[PDB]
Design a binder for this molecule. Structure first.
Ligand SMILES: [Cl-]
Ligand SMILES: [Cl-]
Ligand SMILES: [Cl-]
Ligand SMILES: [Cl-]
Ligand SMILES: [Mg+2]
Length: 795
C-alpha cells in the first residue's frame, strides 16, 4: 500500500549502496509522483535498470493493497537474453520478494500469478497493446536502452505517449475504476531531445533526470590534416602515446573486427613482452620507458564473453593496457584507468534514403554527438586526452550534429507494414519520436497498395501479413510470395538477398597505364562469365555470381573474389541472408537447419528467366521506365548511332515539367546493356535512380519487361486502365450477355492520356474477358490470340 518492506542480506544490500543510482531514489520517486512521464539518463553500470523497478516495487507499485498502483511494473529490453538476465538479477536483489520477479520473452507464455515486476522485449509489450491498448494490467512501464533508437522501441514510445494520455483522462473521470500509468523512458546517454522536446509525443515536456556522477575534463586534440589511411594514422598515434606519455590505458575507436584484429597484432609486434602535434606536452614518469610492453586486447560485439571480460583486468605490472574497439566501447561498462582515446571519427552504419537514392552499409563519419561520447570515455577515472584523427574543419563541416535513428536509415514501407500488422491505423499522424517525411509516408502506403500488402481502405491484407514475416523491404517480400511457380523460389531468394545486402561487384572504381589496360581485359572477361543468362538484365548478373559462389570451395573463396573483383564480405552476407530466408520459408510449412549445400542450384531455363522478370516486376511495378522515343521522339533525339548511356528513358508516374528532358533517366555505363548491338529495351525495370556526376540521372537497372507480362502485373498492381473495345479485322467484340464480353482493349499503364502531368503510356492491344459489375465493365482476365479465336468460334 503506502510502502512495501523488503528484507535483503547484508552482502546484497551493501552491493546496492555502491551503485550510483542508489542515492538518486528520492529524486526519481518525487518525479514519478508528480509526472506521468519521466526520462532517466544514466550510463550502463549506474544500476538504473535493476534499481528503478525495485524503487517502484518498494513504493507500492504492483501491490494489491495499493489504491494508486495495483498493476504490474513492466520493463522492456531490446534483447531476449537481457530481459532474462535482468529478471534473474532483480529476483536475487529483491530478497524475500524475489518470487515477485518474472520475464516474458515469447507471445505464447502466460505469466505466473506472483509476477508483479516483469522484464520483457519491446515486441511482447507491442503485442500486449494489440490485445489491450490501455494496458490496464500495468501501473508502470519502463522502456530501457532507448538511446539505441531501435525502430520498434520508437513505435512503442509513440504508442505509450497516447496510452499514458488516455490512462490520464480515464483516471480524471473515475480514479476508483481507472488507475494512472507511469511511463519511464531510460537512456544510457543525454541525447533524449527527440523524446523530451517532441510536443506531438509529449505536449508538456517530461523531466529529464541525470543519475550519473560528474565526469572529469577531457582535452580534445584534432590533427592538422585528415589522413585517408586512418588505421595507419591510428597505429601511428597509439605508438606515440605509449612511447611518450605518462601512465594510463588507451582506447582506440575503429569501424570493424578486421581493422581491430590487424591493429591488435601490429601493436603486439611493435611493443612485445620478454611535425608539431597537439597533446604531447606531458612526459614519461620515473620507472617508465618508451619501449615498455603493450598489453593489447580487441573489443567488438562478436567476441566470446571470456574475451570481452578481459578488458576489465589490470594489465601486467610494467605494461600498458590498449583496447582496440568498435563503437561498443562508447556506452559499455567503464574500462578502468583510461586516460587516452584515439578516435578515427568513423563507423560502419546502414544508411537508406527516400528521393536521394541512398542504400549503403559502409564506413562514414560519425556524428558530433558520437565523437563527443567517444571523447568523454577518457575522463571517467580522471582528467584525460582525446586524439581526433581528423581536422577541426572536417569535424565542423562534415560531421552531422546528431546521429540518425534507425527509422530514417531503413525503407519507409518496411516501417509502415510493421505498424499495419500491429493494427496501428493512422500512420500520417502517429507520434513518432523522430518522424519520417509525410510525403515519404504517403508514398510508402501507396507502394504497399501496389504490392497488395494493404487494401483499398489501407488495411493489411492476408499477403501483407505474410510479407511482414520477412526481414526484408516489402518489394522483396512480394517477389517471394509470387516466386513459388515452376521452381523459381531459390532464384528469387538469391536475387532478393543480393539486392538486400548490396552490389558485390567492384566496377571501374579502380581503372575506368599499360597495367591498367591489362586489368580491364581480366575485368570484362570476368564480367561476361556472369552475363550468360540474359543480354538485358543486370539482375541475372547478380543471380549468376551468387550461384557461382556456392560451387567455390572454402579455401579457393579469396582467389575467386580476387580474379572476379568481388566484395568478399558482401558475398558471405548474401549466403547468410539466403539461409535466413530459407529458414523462414521452411519453418512456415508446418526444427530447421539450412546448410551451404541446400543453396546449390542449376541454371534457370528460358521459361524460368522470363517468369523471374515478371516476379521482379511484381515487386517493382511502379519502377518501370519506357524508352523516351516511344513517347517523345523529337525531344529524345535518339538515332541508331546514339550511345547506350545517351539514350533517355522516362519513369512511369514521373511528374511533368515544361521541359520533358527533366524527366529523362539514362542507362549506367557499368550496365550489361552497354554491350548491346541493338536499340535497348522499350520497357526497363529499375531498382533505383541516382543523380550522377555528369548531372544526369542514371538508372540502376534490373531487367527488361515485355508489354503483356507488364500488363498482367500492372493489372494486379492497380496501375492499369483500359480503352473502349477496339474495332477491326479479327478484333470484333464477342458478347456472351449484356453483362459479359470478350474484346480487344488498349491497356493504359500508370497515368491516363487526360492526366498528362504524370507519365503514363499505352501497352499493346490485348484480348480481355469483361464483366459489367455495378454498371461498369471490369477486366476479369487477359486472353491469348488463340483463346480469343476459340471464343469467337464458339459464338
Ligand atoms: Cl519467469
Ligand atoms: Cl524520411
Ligand atoms: Cl541490379
Ligand atoms: Cl546498373
Ligand atoms: Mg491509395
Amino acid at each position: 500500500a503506502f510502502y512495501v518492506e523488503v528484507s535483503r542480506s547484508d552482502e546484497i544490500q551493501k552491493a546496492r549502496i555502491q551503485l550510483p543510482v542508489f542515492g538518486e531514489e528520492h529524486k526519481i520517486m518525487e518525479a514519478i509522483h508528480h509526472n506521468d512521464v519521466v526520462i532517466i539518463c544514466g550510463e550502463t553500470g549506474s544500476g538504473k535498470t535493476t534499481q528503478v523497478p525495485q524503487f517502484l516495487y518498494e513504493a507500492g507499485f504492483g501491490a494489491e493493497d495499493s489504491p494508486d498502483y495495483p498493476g504490474m511494473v513492466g520493463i522492456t529490453q531490446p534483447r531476449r537474453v537481457a530481459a532474462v538476465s535482468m529478471a534473474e538479477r532483480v529476483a536475487n536483489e529483491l530478497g524475500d520478494h524475489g518470487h515477485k520477479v518474472g520475464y516474458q520473452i515469447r507471445f505464447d507464455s502466460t505469466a505466473k500469478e506472483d509476477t508483479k515486476v516483469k522484464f520483457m522485449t519491446d515486441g511482447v509489450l507491442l503485442r500486449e497493446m494489440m490485445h489491450d491498448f490501455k494496458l490496464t494490467k500495468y501501473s508502470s512501464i519502463i522502456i530501457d536502452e532507448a538511446h539505441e533508437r531501435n525502430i520498434n522501441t520508437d513505435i512503442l514510445i509513440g504508442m505509450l505517449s497516447r496510452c499514458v494520455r488516455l490512462r490520464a483522462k480515464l483516471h480524471k473521470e473515475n480514479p476508483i475504476e481507472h488507475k494512472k500509468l507511469k511511463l519511464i523512458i531510460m537512456s544510457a546517454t543525454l541525447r533524449v531531445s527527440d523524446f523530451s522536446e517532441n510536443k506531438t509525443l509529449f505536449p508538456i515536456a517530461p523531466p529529464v533526470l541525470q543519475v550519473d556522477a560528474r565526469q572529469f575534463p577531457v582535452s580534445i586534440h584534432f590533427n592538422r590534416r585528415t589522413a585517408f589511411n586512418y588505421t595507419d594514422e591510428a597505429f601511428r598515434k597509439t605508438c606515440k602515446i605509449h612511447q611518450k606519455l605518462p601512465p594510463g590505458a588507451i582506447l582506440v575507436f575503429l569501424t570493424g573486427q578486421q581493422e581491430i584484429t590487424h591493429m591488435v597484432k601490429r601493436l603486439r609486434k611493435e611493443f612485445p613482452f620478454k611535425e608539431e602535434e597537439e597533446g604531447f606536452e606531458e612526459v614519461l614518469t620515473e620507472g617508465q620507458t618508451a619501449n615498455d610492453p603493450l598489453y593489447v586486447l580487441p573489443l567488438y560485439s562478436l567476441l566470446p564473453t571470456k574475451e570481452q571480460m578481459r578488458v576489465f583486468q589490470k594489465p601486467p605490472q610494467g605494461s600498458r593496457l590498449c583496447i582496440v574497439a568498435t563503437n561498443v566501447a562508447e556506452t559499455s561498462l567503464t574500462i578502468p584507468g583510461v586516460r587516452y582515446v584515439v578516435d578515427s571519427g568513423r563507423s560502419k552504419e546502414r544508411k537508406y534514403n527516400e528521393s536521394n537514392g541512398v542504400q549503403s552499409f559502409e564506413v562514414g563519419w560519425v556524428s558530433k554527438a558520437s565523437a563527443n561520447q567517444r571523447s568523454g570515455r577518457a575522463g571517467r577515472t580522471g582528467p584525460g586526452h582525446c586524439y581526433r584523427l581528423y581536422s577541426s574543419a572536417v569535424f565542423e563541416h562534415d560531421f552531422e550534429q546528431f546521429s540518425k535513428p534507425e527509422i530514417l536509415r531503413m525503407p519507409v514501407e518496411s516501417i509502415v507494414l510493421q505498424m499495419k500488422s500491429m493494427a496501428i491505423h493512422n500512420i500520417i499522424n502517429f507520434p513518432f519520436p523522430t518522424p519520417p517525411d509525410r510525403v515519404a509516408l504517403s508514398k510508402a502506403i501507396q507502394l504497399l497498395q501496389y504490392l497488395g500488402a494493404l487494401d483499398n481502405k489501407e488495411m493489411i491484407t492476408e499477403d501483407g501479413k505474410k510479407m511482414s514475416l520477412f526481414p526484408l523491404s516489402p518489394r522483396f517480400s512480394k517477389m517471394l510470395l509470387v516466386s513459388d511457380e515452376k521452381a523459381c523460389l531459390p532464384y528469387i531468394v538469391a536475387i532478393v538477398s543480393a539486392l538486400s545486402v548490396g552490389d558485390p561487384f567492384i566496377n571501374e572504381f579502380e581503372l575506368g597505364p599499360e597495367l591498367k589496360k591489362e586489368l580491364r581485359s581480366k575485368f570484362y572477361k570476368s564480367r561476361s562469365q556472369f552475363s550468360k543468362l540474359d543480354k538485358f538484365s543486370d539482375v541475372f548478373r547478380l543471380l549468376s555470381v551468387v550461384s557461382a559462389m556456392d560451387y567455390v570451395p572454402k579455401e579457393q573463396k579469396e582467389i575467386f573474389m580476387k580474379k572476379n573483383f568481388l566484395r568478399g564480405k558482401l558475398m558471405e552476407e548474401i549466403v547468410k541472408l539466403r539461409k535466413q530466408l530459407m529458414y523462414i520459408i521452411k519453418s512456415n510449412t508446418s526444427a530447421v537447419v539450412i546448410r551451404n549445400e541446400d543453396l546449390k542450384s542449376d541454371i534457370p531455363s528460358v521459361i524460368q528467366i522470363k517468369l523471374l522478370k515478371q516476379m521482379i516486376c511484381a515487386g517493382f511495378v511502379d519502377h518501370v521506365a519506357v524508352r523516351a522515343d516511344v513517347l517523345f521522339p523529337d525531344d529524345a533525339k535518339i538515332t541508331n548511332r546514339t550511345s547506350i548511356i545517351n539514350i533517355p528513358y522516362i519513369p512511369v508516374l514521373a511528374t511533368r515539367t515544361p521541359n520533358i528532358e527533366d524527366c529523362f533517366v539514362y542507362i549506367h555505363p557499368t550496365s550489361i546493356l552497354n554491350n548491346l548491338g541493338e536499340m535497348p529495351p522499350k520497357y526497363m525495370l529499375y531498382y533505383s535512380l541516382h543523380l550522377g556526376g555528369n548531372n544526369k540521372t542514371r538508372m540502376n537497372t534490373l531487367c527488361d519487361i515485355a508489354s503483356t507480362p507488364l500488363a498482367n502485373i500492372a493489372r494486379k498492381g492497380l496501375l492499369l486502365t483500359y480503352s473502349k473495345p477496339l474495332t477491326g479485322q479479327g478484333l470484333k467484340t464477342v458478347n456472351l450477355s449484356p453483362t459479359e464480353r470478350y474484346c480487344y482493349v488498349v491497356p493504359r499503364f500508370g497515368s491516363t492520356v487526360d492526366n498528362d502531368l504524370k507519365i503514363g503510356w499505352d501497352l499493346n492491344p490485348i484480348a480481355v474477358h469483361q464483366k459489367k459489375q455495378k454498371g461498369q465493365w471490369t477486366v476479369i482476365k487477359f486472353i491469348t490470340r488463340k483463346g480469343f479465336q476459340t471464343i469467337t468460334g464458339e459464338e
